[PDB]
Amino acid sequence: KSPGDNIDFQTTILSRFDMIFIVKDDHNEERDISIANHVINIHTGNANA
Amino acid sequence: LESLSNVKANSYSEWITQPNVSRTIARELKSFLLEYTDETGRSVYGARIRTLGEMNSESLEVNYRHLAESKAILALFLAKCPEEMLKIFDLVAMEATELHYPDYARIHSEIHVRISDFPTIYSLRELRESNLSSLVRVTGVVTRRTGVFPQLKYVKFNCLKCGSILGPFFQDSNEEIRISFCTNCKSKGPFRVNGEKTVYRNYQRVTLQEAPGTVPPGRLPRHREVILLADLVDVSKPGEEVEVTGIYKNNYDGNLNAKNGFPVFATIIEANSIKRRVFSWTEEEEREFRKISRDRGIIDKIISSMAPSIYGHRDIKTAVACSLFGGVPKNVNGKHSIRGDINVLLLGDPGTAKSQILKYVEKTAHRAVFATGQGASAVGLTASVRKDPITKEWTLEGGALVLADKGVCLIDEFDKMNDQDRTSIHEAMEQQSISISKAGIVTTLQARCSIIAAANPNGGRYNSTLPLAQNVSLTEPILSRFDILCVVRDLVDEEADERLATFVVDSHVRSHPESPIPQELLMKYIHYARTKIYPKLHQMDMDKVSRVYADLRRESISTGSFPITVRHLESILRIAESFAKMRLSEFVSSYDLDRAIKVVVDSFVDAQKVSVRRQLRRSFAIY
Ligand SMILES: Nc1ncnc2c1ncn2[C@@H]1O[C@H](COP(=O)(O)OP(=O)(O)OP(=O)(O)O)[C@@H](O)[C@H]1O
Ligand SMILES: [Mg+2]
Ligand SMILES: [Zn+2]
């Protein structure tokens, strides 16, 4: 479906912004592993230091 | 005189003020205090004054039973004219303290007397004109309260002709005192009280209302006004039944009698003693806490102690415990906030006892606040600026979310909130802070609280054939801020019916007139654990957690379900932190990780449609 259909308002509102960022959640083994490692590292306290 | 006081000269008030009999009864009371002893032979009053001096107190409690048994005549005269004898017995107590302790007047210039165990007990509707200026004992509920005000005790005056400051003159708490003669000037001109050289005391007014249970059918409760002086202020907050001992007297000052109409008077009660009709601990309790913690299987020991008045619903009770204990908040360089409060949602069919779990949580938490989207409640959900009906002052009040900072906010009938309540809830859950711009005030308030909510599905019954998002009137932004979603279905089964029915019928038949940790210790355990335990993680479970997360992601995407997102990993870590806190340990074990994994995976699977649900049951059978 078109990005205009995905939103829930008049499509002319999108004409007002300067930059648009449609971020998608694609599934990937290595990216999931990397993000999980990052998050548990943050929670443990290493990324704090 | 010597116990000849049974002879009556004239009215009792006149008799009790003669200097000779005054001295007689003063010595008699001093002998009572110095000599009284029970069978055990210990100096009960001696110990009372000893501890009084040790603690640097201001008042002595006295038993009416002992005094009556010893000195019936004094007891009777106290019951008749207590106003006079309170003064002399205060002096007796002061001299006793001086005898035991030196230079007590250095710190405290007064020692009040509190009576106790008065035989007759009245209700606010029984007082009449034969009780005036006498001793009474009543009971009721506290309905409204004032602040603490300063009242004059030792007034000092300024002479306007010469700057002399006339010495202290006692204020008797009967009528304002004045002066008319200056020793220096020999004058009589204007005077003004000196505020910087005067000593004051504490004053407070309280309204007592009868307990509704005791009112015979067909009538309405009565009420009175009470006066609390010195260290009786801020002892009985609104909403608790109390027993008050005091002197029943008219408002003799009134305003004036030129008022037209029948000459009627108002009355008050001046309180002498007040009593009530915890989460602290000590070394004795701390050792027992640590001993109980060391035992294996303490988590299931705790879970069985949640809501004893309900049968089954083990998942609900474990989730309740998890959200009632809580995780640990984090902040990386003070620029990335992670919350530590675990939120739960109850979505069940009618007659599933959700309100009972909420009531239990309210009665068991240290700081729990009750709100609701429909009905009467002591507080709303939005902050506002509003008048005070008694002080006539503007005030800034937050909602139940602000009021329960570092606590738990309970919301009943979560499906019936209006736009304002929904906005407030969303802001509190998303930012943990509430803003306001009203009546010239712009500020932000902290809203770091835990939320436990109950709702109902559309139509009153659960449609298991559709996803949970289509069973409730709520929206994704709000629904995605919960950690544990609990779905209750009233599926018809027999054995469950016998178990629940026997529970209910037995409960009813016990209440006809004619393993688990004790609750009182559990409260202190919870307070101490939240106060003193901040468990920590180890980097050796990262591989396990990452593998489990990858498996969950892959299966969820394969089966076309609601997406599994990193929020579930964070919820798992929070629940593991809470499980570790349950044990008083300082580190996150692997068993806690397993329990958190089970909880979150089961919550996620139970909230899908039948086909997807049954597909996901096989895949995640490891847990
Ligand atoms: N499983 C149960 N065990 C014991 N008592 C129960 C159980 N389920 C319901 N009850 C009792 O039945 C009545 C149900 O009323 P309650 O307000 O507790 O239900 P609810 O699930 O909050 O429903 P709702 O608010 O939709 O009416 C109460 O007396 C409750 O004590
Ligand atoms: Mg209910
Ligand atoms: Zn003068």
Can you give B171-191 as a three-state secondary structure string? CCCCCCCCCCCCCCCCCCCCE
Task: Collapse the DSSP code of B575 into the 3-class scheme (helix H, G, I; strand E, B; otherwise coil) and give the result.
Answer: helix
DSSP letter at B536 equals B
**What resolution does the deposited structure have, in angstroms?**
3.0
Q: Ligand 1: which residue has its CA nearest to atom 17?
A: B355
Report how far residue B111's alpha carbon sits from residue B289's, in angstroms, rounded to the nearest whole number: 41
B278-623: CATH, from 3.40.50.300, 3.30.70.141, 2.40.50.140, 3.40.30.10: 3.40.50.300
Cα–Cα distances in Å, from A32 out to A25, A28, B179, B575?
Answer: 11, 6, 88, 21
* CA torsion through residues B300, B302, B308, B312, sign: negative
Could you tell me the CA-to-CA distances from B194 to B162, B197, B202, B434 in Å, in that order?
A: 14, 6, 18, 47
Q: Which residues contact B525 (CB under 8 A, 6 or more apart)?
A: B289, B292, B517
The verdict on whether residue B349 carries a ligand-binding annotation is yes
CA separation (Å) from B394 to B234, B389, B441? 22, 10, 12
Residues of B in contact with A36 (CB under 8 A): 542, 545-546, 549-550, 566, 569
Q: What is the DSSP string of B60-76?
A: EEEEHHHHHHHHHHHHH
Instruction: State the Cα–Cα distance between residues B240 and B29, nearest whole angstrom.
Output: 35
- Using CA coordinates, name the residue in chain B closest to A46: B539
- In 3-state terms, what secondary structure has residue B228? strand
Spatial distance between the Cα atoms of B125 and B145, rounded to a whole number of angstroms: 21
Q: Residue for token digits 């490891």?
A: B622
Instruction: Centre a 10 Å sphere on the Cβ of residue B622 and count the other Cβ atoms it contains.
Output: 10
Burial class (CB in 10 A: 0-12, 13-18, 19+), B338: middle
For residues B309 and B356, give the distance between their C-alpha atoms in angstroms, rounded to a whole number.
8
Helices (H) and strands (E) in chain A, counts: 2, 0
Distance, CA of B366 to CA of B450 (rounded, Å):
12
- State whether residue B199 is helix, strand or coil: strand
Phi-psi region of B446 (alpha: psi -120 to 50; beta: other; left: phi over 0): beta
Q: Mapping DSSP to helix (H, G, I), strand (E, B) and coil, where does residue B378 land?
A: coil
- Contact (Cβ atoms closer than 8 angstroms) between residue B74 and residue B28: yes
The alpha carbon torsion through B355, B358, B362, B365 (nearest 10 deg) reads 160
Pairing mode, strands B134-145 and B191-193: unpaired
State the sign of the Cα–Cα–Cα–Cα dihedral B552, B557, B562, B564.
positive
Dihedral angle over CA of B208, B210, B213, B217, nearest 10:
-150
In angstroms, how far is the first alpha carbon of chain A from the final one? 45
Q: Report the candidate in B352, B347, B424, B354 with the shortest Cα–Cα distance to residue B382.
A: B424
Q: Which residues contact B337 (CB under 8 A, 6 or more apart)?
A: B329, B330, B331, B432
Task: Describe the crossing of helices B64-80 and B82-100 by its angle, rounded to 10 degrees.
Answer: 140
What's at B328, amino acid-wise? Answer: V
SS3 for A37? helix
What is the residue whose two structure tokens read 């005269």? B77
Using most ligand atoms within 8 A of CB, pick from B314, B316, B356, B497 the residue to mutate for ligand 1: B356
Q: Which amino acid is at B531?
A: T
Which residue carries 């204020």 as its tokens?
B171
Residue bearing tokens 């001046």: B270
| Smallest Cα distance from A41 to chain B, Å | 8
Residue of A nearest to B536 (CA): A44
Between the two ends of chain B, the Cα-to-Cα distance in Å is 90
If one counts every other C-beta atom within 10 angstroms of the C-beta of residue B126, the result is 11
CB of B350 closer than 6 angstroms to any ligand 1 atom: yes
Indicate which residue's Cα is closest to atom 26 of ligand 1: B350
Which residues, at least 6 apart from B53, have a Cβ–Cβ distance to it below 8 Å?
B97, B100, B101, B104
* Residue of B143, B250, B152 whose CA lies nearest to B206: B143
Q: For residues B132 and B103, what is the distance between their CA atoms, to the nearest angstrom?
A: 39
Type and span of the H or E element at B422: helix B419-431
User: Position of tokens 């002998």?
Assistant: B31
- Of B432, B535, B419, B433, which Cα lies nearest the Cα of B475? B419
State the ligand closest to the CA atom of B186.
Answer: 3
Residue spans of the domains in chain B: they are: 19-120, 121-152+200-277, 153-199, 278-623
Give the CATH number of domain B19-120: 3.30.1640.10
- Per the CB < 8 A criterion, the answer to whether B571 and B482 are in contact is no
Can you list the positions of beta strands (E) in B340-432?
A: 344-348, 368-372, 384-387, 394-397, 408-412
- Residue A37 at interface with chain B, using a CB cutoff of 8 Å: yes
Does residue B562 line the site of ligand 1, with CB under 6 A? no
Cα–Cα distance between B470 and B487 in angstroms, integer? 13
Which residues touch B249 (CB under 8 Å, ≥6 apart)?
B132, B133, B267, B268, B269, B270
Q: Taking Cα atoms as reference points, which of B339, B348, B581 lies closest to residue B481?
A: B339
Alpha helix locations (H) across B36-123?
A: 44-55, 64-80, 82-100
Residue of B595, B580, B600, B589 lying closest to B530 (CA atoms): B580
User: Among the residues of A3-44, which ranges form H helices?
Assistant: 3-6, 29-44
- Cα–chain center distance at B20: 50
